[PDB]
Design a protein around this ligand. Sequence first.
Ligand code: 5LD
Ligand code: 5LD
Ligand code: 5LD
Ligand code: 5LD
Ligand code: 5LD
Ligand code: 5LD
Ligand code: CL
Ligand code: CL
Ligand code: MN
Ligand code: MN
Ligand code: MN
Ligand code: MN
Ligand code: MN
Ligand code: MN
Ligand code: MN
Ligand code: MN
Ligand code: MN
Ligand code: MN
Ligand code: MN
Ligand code: MN
Lengths: 199, 199, 199, 199, 199, 199
Amino acid sequence: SARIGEVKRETKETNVSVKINLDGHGVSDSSTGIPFLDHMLDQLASHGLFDVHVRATGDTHIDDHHTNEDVALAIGTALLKALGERKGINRFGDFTAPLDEALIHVSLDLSGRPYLGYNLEIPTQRVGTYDTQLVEHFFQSLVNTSGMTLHIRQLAGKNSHHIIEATFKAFARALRQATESDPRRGGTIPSSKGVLSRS
Amino acid sequence: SARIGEVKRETKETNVSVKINLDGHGVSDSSTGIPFLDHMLDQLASHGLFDVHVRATGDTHIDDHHTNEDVALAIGTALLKALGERKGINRFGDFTAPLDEALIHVSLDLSGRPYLGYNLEIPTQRVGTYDTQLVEHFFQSLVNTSGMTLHIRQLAGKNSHHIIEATFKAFARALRQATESDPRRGGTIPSSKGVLSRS
Amino acid sequence: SARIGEVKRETKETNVSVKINLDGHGVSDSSTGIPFLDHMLDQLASHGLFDVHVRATGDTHIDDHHTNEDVALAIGTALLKALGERKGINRFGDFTAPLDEALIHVSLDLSGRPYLGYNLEIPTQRVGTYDTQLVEHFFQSLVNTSGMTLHIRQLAGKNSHHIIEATFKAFARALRQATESDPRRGGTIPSSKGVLSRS
Amino acid sequence: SARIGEVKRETKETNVSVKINLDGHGVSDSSTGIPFLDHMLDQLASHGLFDVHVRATGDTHIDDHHTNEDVALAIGTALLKALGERKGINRFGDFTAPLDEALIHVSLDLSGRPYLGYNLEIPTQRVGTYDTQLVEHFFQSLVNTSGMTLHIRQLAGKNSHHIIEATFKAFARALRQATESDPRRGGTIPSSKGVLSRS
Amino acid sequence: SARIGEVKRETKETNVSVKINLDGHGVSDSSTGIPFLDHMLDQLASHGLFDVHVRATGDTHIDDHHTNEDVALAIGTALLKALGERKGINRFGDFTAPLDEALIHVSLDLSGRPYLGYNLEIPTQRVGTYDTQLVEHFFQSLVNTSGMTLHIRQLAGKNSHHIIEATFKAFARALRQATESDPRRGGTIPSSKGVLSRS
Amino acid sequence: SARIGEVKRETKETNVSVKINLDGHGVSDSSTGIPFLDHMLDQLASHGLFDVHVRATGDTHIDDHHTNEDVALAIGTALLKALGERKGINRFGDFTAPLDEALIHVSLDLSGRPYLGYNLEIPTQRVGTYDTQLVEHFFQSLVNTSGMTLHIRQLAGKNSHHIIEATFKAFARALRQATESDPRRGGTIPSSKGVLSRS
Ligand SMILES: O=P(O)(O)C[C@H](O)Cn1cncn1
Ligand SMILES: O=P(O)(O)C[C@H](O)Cn1cncn1
Ligand SMILES: O=P(O)(O)C[C@H](O)Cn1cncn1
Ligand SMILES: O=P(O)(O)C[C@H](O)Cn1cncn1
Ligand SMILES: O=P(O)(O)C[C@H](O)Cn1cncn1
Ligand SMILES: O=P(O)(O)C[C@H](O)Cn1cncn1
Ligand SMILES: [Cl-]
Ligand SMILES: [Cl-]
Ligand SMILES: [Mn+2]
Ligand SMILES: [Mn+2]
Ligand SMILES: [Mn+2]
Ligand SMILES: [Mn+2]
Ligand SMILES: [Mn+2]
Ligand SMILES: [Mn+2]
Ligand SMILES: [Mn+2]
Ligand SMILES: [Mn+2]
Ligand SMILES: [Mn+2]
Ligand SMILES: [Mn+2]
Ligand SMILES: [Mn+2]
Ligand SMILES: [Mn+2]
């Protein structure tokens, strides 16, 4: 049966709803109020094969920050819920993807333990209307609620849209791999300590 | 009524029990299987005025790592449970404490959002039998489950025991401050967004 | 009786009204025409417990500069009026607050003597639509009319919104401390020279 | 039929027995007299899905060196025996795995030709009682008897236990991949020269 | 009952009398024969709320050194006597105070263990007739007899009078904090080892 | 009549007893629970000709730190008591001693004024089980209670045991010299100010 996580999250700053199917067919349905982020979430669906449903509204007149953050938090929680006990999964994901001159390595472990290693150097401040500082924050917030160890490494790149989009493509493929069933492990928990937890 | 958090946490590596009273009288009752850590937890009680009850066993024949980590995780969860909705608290804590030549600044925010900034340079590898790398890991794990933003800055120090112990003293006082009641805010949540959460 | 300062200030560039209660309950009521600034003033209320009422209009088609400046001037005057002779207060405030990876130290003295020490390095030029140069100018103008010695020190930070917001949180807490009653000094002026003045 | 390699190896320094199933279910059964090494061998089973049976005794009063070395030699021989002619396998393995802040890339070729490329910089001398120089020696000895080309690259890391354990996790996954059946090659030897040999 | 320490100290170089009330109302009554020092002691009273009574005479025709030193020694002894067993106190003090462009951080621990960490760089040799080397010596001598761990850190400053005076203001506030009653600790000794002593 | 100082000192961490005869015959009787320290105290007796009786127990399961410190404190107090008014003594001591390649200069003044200047660079972290950071702490604590100005300068050395032991030999000889009777001064106090005191 498909692993689906659903989240509603609201504060005085933002209102967010997320539904993610780990066992999806790449259904893309993201509307965050941040068009560039929507385009990136579309890569998560197209390349990760997640079904990604996101709705957000928020205080974008202040800046895109709170929206971006709260979307990421809610996505991370949806991943946590869908993953459950993490029985029988690959756990680890590793993929390097390009977009033209950009080349980004993503490695992750669905350990339960939040950590972000990130070294992107995005050479412009705005891609469309999107503040490029928010990319790091998206991943940081997502790892915090999902209980993910995540490394993002820039191997090459100059165009900011290419750098960011290659990151999402690599992330999508690494996350797909990690969430997928391990065909040899017979449904067992993939941990020598017998459990995977965010606590 | 006193804010008390209780946690039991067990894996194939370790077995941990924690009870913390935020509104304590400094009752010290820590036995982790790591004597140096016990001594540090005793500062948390003595200077923070938390009642700190900790029991742990684990795979110390491998190394103190898993025990140290899992104690920290469980303490963080106990803090999270005791704090609840975080209504009426100071939220922020800030304190710099010495131990002789050592001087350590600790600043924290009980935001719900885990983050550790840490720059200690502990010049020896073992204090007694305790691996000095485990200090950073203790705080990292604790912030992750407690939902704490924490900065630890070494301003001076040479003796490893002094550096580490001053850190725990400063942390204890900053955490005390942050967890204490704000006498002017009338029980309100100390956040412009109306909520403080680890999600 | 509550210490309240009220200011109306108008030029050909801007029109500003401010009312601040030093002895407030954190009532937030700021509308400057600069949404990011409103969000920052909201931290001043939430964390400083000032009641902050601000209205401004101005020549934002030129840039946010004159508005930002004139709001700050008027706030400083409101603080000066509310403070009066400064009898019985703590006078000094000192607080370091984080926002995730950002960490900002604010120290101030309600001496009457305007001074700003500031070393923020905000790595992007715009947070939303807000020009990040205007942060320094806000504090500079505020100290000039309030008669405040103010130091703002960036200890850590990368995200521009985090850096700026941590600054306002630290400032709010330091200003709260400084303006609050000193419970031991018996209503006396906190100065060896017998007076505190902007002249 | 499952590919199983069994080795008994004894000198005046050590006594070692190894049994490895390449086509295992992750059965972990390692007791080397070096607890940290046992914990690492447990990752080899848990993540590589090898059945790993190891027993060793030896001159640990001198140091763990001879034991560590001779265990590695015997494991390498067991791999060589189990692999046989290396018909129909993937041959190459490539995986990057993290453990929190640590990130280690392992690439290997089951060519028959021993080579170790290794650049770990493990910042402490002892993890528990285990001498961290012995990690490099473990892999060097293993490649020598197994006939493996192996590269181990530290991409990130600070905690010695994390660095070493991430290495074993990445190694386990790369070795799993390399030893597994290539579903398209129809049982053929994966070499343009028609043979894979340690001679 | 108020904690008062009284000292008479005389040598062939100097004659000194000190009386300090830890629980004072800021009574300033210092006449050392060194006017600049008197002005600084006046800050100790005004901002620390100590009652400070000092009389000294000495060999100022040689230089202010012996007087400055012996005043400091006697003040430290008076603090030691007044503090007694140090039951129920905060123990630690931490405060950063400015004077215009100067900004000085003082952190102290009333541990019993004398230590001075000091990094002031006072850019002129004389403030009035007062030799600016004597500032460091004042604090060094004071810590030695009081049994105080003391750190003084220059964060900013150019004017020598500002640097020195900000130091005394910060020191006064940190010492006030440390000597004050801890309202939660119920009169207990604030030390995990059960005693605070200069021996 | 022989100058003998006796001290009992106990906390929750340690229990210490010291008896020192300044006018001894080199009777060595030290048992601190730290064998390396005992060996060093034996040099103090053998080369200084002090009769040195020390007993300590303490929390060595945490580390040797508290024991080492408290032994030093108690020895310093015993020296202070035995020295009394310091009439008729040499006061100053100066000696440089080698141990093979190591060469250590010790200069001291029995002034009453505690100060340690120390520049040893001991190239290993443990000599036997003894943490080499504790050497500096031993001397620092000793000067604090004895009222000694002490300089320790490493002129040469590589072997940690040689460096430390040469330090104790030089210290022993310098202290012997300083404590011995000045045969020309006729019992007078060796100070132009007419008194030597720790206050
Ligand atoms: O990665 P896991 O949790 O499956 C097993 C590890 O042994 C736990 N660990 C966490 N830090 C060091 N080791
Ligand atoms: O600190 P908070 O959550 O009370 C309010 C902040 O506005 C939320 N925030 C988080 N990142 C930037 N802003
Ligand atoms: O800070 P104050 O004004 O209370 C007293 C100072 O002595 C005045 N001052 C100003 N510059 C140097 N000293
Ligand atoms: O990797 P192989 O042995 O399958 C084929 C290679 O051509 C052999 N070789 C070894 N060095 C250079 N080439
Ligand atoms: O600061 P204290 O004396 O309350 C307790 C410390 O454990 C004693 N100590 C002194 N050096 C290292 N530890
Ligand atoms: O060394 P003493 O105490 O005998 C005499 C000195 O004159 C006192 N002194 C202390 N600092 C400077 N001089
Ligand atoms: Cl600082
Ligand atoms: Cl790479
Ligand atoms: Mn944020
Ligand atoms: Mn695109
Ligand atoms: Mn770990
Ligand atoms: Mn201690
Ligand atoms: Mn302007
Ligand atoms: Mn915000
Ligand atoms: Mn070897
Ligand atoms: Mn492990
Ligand atoms: Mn002097
Ligand atoms: Mn002045
Ligand atoms: Mn110590
Ligand atoms: Mn020897």
